[PDB]
C-alpha cells in the first residue's frame, strides 16, 4: 500500500447555466482516494461595475465502472486476463466536443464510456427536475454543439417560478358515485389513496425516496446512482477597475475573481471506477420584469390577501402563468404553485431602468421568453441570457485555474518493478 501522487493543475472555463466536469480520476477497487482542490474562479470581463455575485457549486462523485459497463463489466473483471475488451463510445469529429466530460476528443474521436455515462447518471440523479425527461443520449455524438462543449443545462436557483410543483400535479381528484348515494367508507379510502399519490408526485418520484419514506435505505447500487462524495459552494466576488483616461474617467469594469478550496475527505474506493468533479456557476434570477404576485392579480379576493389559515391548508394548488409574474411573462407557460405561497416568500426587485442596461447579470427578459411556451425550457438556465453583460467571452462566460492535489494509497508495484524483468 503506497502513495501515488496524482496532483495536477487545470485551467478551465464554461457557460453560465451549464454543468462542466473539471477533473476526473480513474480509481481501482481498494484505492483510498483523497482530493484537495484549491484555486480561483473568475468571469469574463464585465461591461459595468459589479452588481451581484454568482453562486459557484463544486461536486465530486464516485461512479463504479459497473454502473456504466453493466453486467458486461462484471464479466470483464471475472474473465480477467481474457475478458472481451470494454467498448468505447463516439464523439463528433471536433476537439472540443468532449468538454462536458473534461477532455479533448482524442485522436480517434472516441472516449471511454464511463466518462460519458457517468456524466449522464450524475445529471439524471441530481441535476434535472425529477419530472423532466430523463437524459438518455447514447453516445457523446448524439449530443448537440452547446451541450457537448459546455455541459448540460441545470435549473435556475429555486424561486416561485423556477421551482414550481411538478406540472402533472393533481388539481382535483374525482371519485365514482352511484346515482343517489355515496360510499362514505369508500370516500375514505379514496382520500387515503390520493394521499399516497400526492406524497409521490410531490417528493417521492425516485425509488430511493419512496423506500426512505418507509424508513428504509438503499445502496447506491440499488438504483445505480453516482455517489455524491463532496459538495462545496461559494459566492464569487471581486472588484471594480476605475477608468482613468479623458473619456473612460468615471467608468468602471467589474472583475469577478474569487479564490476557493474544495476538499474531499479520504475516501475508500470499493470497486474500480471514476472520481468525477464538476462545477456549476449561476446567477440568481433577478429580473426588472418580475413583480409580486399580488400586484399582478386584478381581482384581489379574500382567499388571496387575507391569508386565512383555515384556507391555506385545505385548498388545491393554484394554476398561474408566467404572465402573472412578469410584465412580458409568456402566458402559455402554466405553473402550479402552492396557495398563498406569495406570502411565504418575497421577490427580488430591480427598478425597470436597469431593463436595457448592458452589463448587469439580470434577466432583462422574462424567463424562457425565447424558448417558447415550454416550461422546462424556461426553468433551465439559458446561458445566452447573459451574453449581454460580458465585454468579450474569449474564455466563455466564466473560467477558472486551480491545482488539484490528489493523494491515493493503492496496491501498486513500483515503476522499477514494472520495468525490471528479473
Amino acid at each position: 500500500r503506497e502513495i501515488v501522487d496524482l496532483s495536477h493543475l487545470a485551467f478551465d472555463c464554461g457557460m453560465l447555466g451549464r454543468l462542466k466536469t473539471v477533473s476526473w480520476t480513474p480509481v481501482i477497487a481498494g484505492d483510498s482516494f483523497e482530493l484537495d482542490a484549491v484555486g480561483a474562479l473568475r468571469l469574463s470581463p464585465l461591461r459595468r461595475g459589479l452588481a451581484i455575485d454568482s453562486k459557484v457549486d463544486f461536486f465530486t462523485f464516485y461512479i463504479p465502472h459497473r454502473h456504466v459497463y453493466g453486467d458486461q463489466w462484471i464479466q470483464f473483471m471475472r474473465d480477467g486476463v481474457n475478458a472481451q475488451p470494454l467498448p468505447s463510445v463516439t464523439c463528433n469529429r471536433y476537439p472540443d466536443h468532449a468538454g462536458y466530460v473534461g477532455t479533448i476528443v482524442p485522436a480517434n474521436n472516441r472516449i471511454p464510456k464511463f466518462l460519458h455515462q457517468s456524466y449522464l447518471n450524475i445529471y439524471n440523479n441530481y441535476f434535472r427536475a425529477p419530472w423532466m425527461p430523463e437524459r438518455t443520449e447514447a453516445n457523446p455524438s448524439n449530443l448537440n454543439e452547446d451541450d457537448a462543449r459546455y455541459g448540460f443545462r441545470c435549473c435556475h436557483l429555486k424561486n416561485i417560478w423556477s421551482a414550481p410543483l411538478p406540472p402533472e400535479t393533481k388539481l382535483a381528484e374525482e371519485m365514482g358515485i352511484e346515482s343517489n348515494s355515496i360510499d362514505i367508507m369508500g370516500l375514505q379510502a379514496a382520500y387515503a389513496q390520493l394521499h399516497t399519490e400526492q406524497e409521490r408526485t410531490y417528493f417521492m418520484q425516485r425509488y430511493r425516496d419512496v423506500i426512505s419514506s418507509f424508513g428504509g435505505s438503499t445502496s447506491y447500487d440499488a438504483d445505480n446512482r453516482p455517489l455524491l462524495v463532496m459538495h462545496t459552494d461559494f459566492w464569487a466576488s471581486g472588484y471594480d477597475v476605475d477608468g482613468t483616461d479623458q473619456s473612460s474617467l468615471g467608468q468602471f469594469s467589474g472583475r469577478v475573481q474569487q479564490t476557493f478550496k474544495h476538499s474531499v475527505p479520504r475516501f475508500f474506493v470499493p470497486e474500480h471506477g471514476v472520481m468525477m468533479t464538476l462545477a456549476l456557476i449561476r446567477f440568481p434570477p433577478i429580473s426588472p420584469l418580475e413583480h409580486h404576485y399580488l400586484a399582478g392579480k386584478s381581482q384581489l379576493t379574500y382567499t388571496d390577501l387575507a391569508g386565512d389559515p383555515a384556507l391555506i391548508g385545505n385548498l388545491p394548488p393554484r394554476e398561474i402563468s408566467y404572465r402573472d409574474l412578469f410584465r412580458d411573462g409568456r402566458s402559455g407557460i402554466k405553473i402550479k404553485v402552492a396557495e398563498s405561497i406569495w406570502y411565504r416568500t418575497h421577490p427580488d426587485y430591480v427598478n425597470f431602468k436597469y431593463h436595457d442596461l448592458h452589463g448587469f447579470p439580470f434577466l432583462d427578459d422574462a424567463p424562457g421568453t425565447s424558448t417558447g411556451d415550454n416550461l422546462q425550457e424556461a426553468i433551465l438556465v439559458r446561458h445566452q441570457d447573459y451574453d449581454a453583460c460580458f465585454q468579450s467571452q474569449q474564455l466563455l462566460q466564466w473560467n477558472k485555474q486551480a491545482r488539484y492535489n490528489v493523494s491515493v494509497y493503492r496496491h501498486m508495484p513500483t515503476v522499477r518493478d514494472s520495468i525490471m524483468t528479473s
Partner: peptide, 26 residues
Amino acid sequence: ARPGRPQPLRGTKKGARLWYVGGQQF
C-alpha cells in the same frame, strides 16, 4: 470561499520513483 487575492499556480509536484532515463537529467 477563500479570502486571499488570486495567486498564479506553481509546480505539478510524493511516493517512489517514476522516471528512469539512464541516469541524472535535470
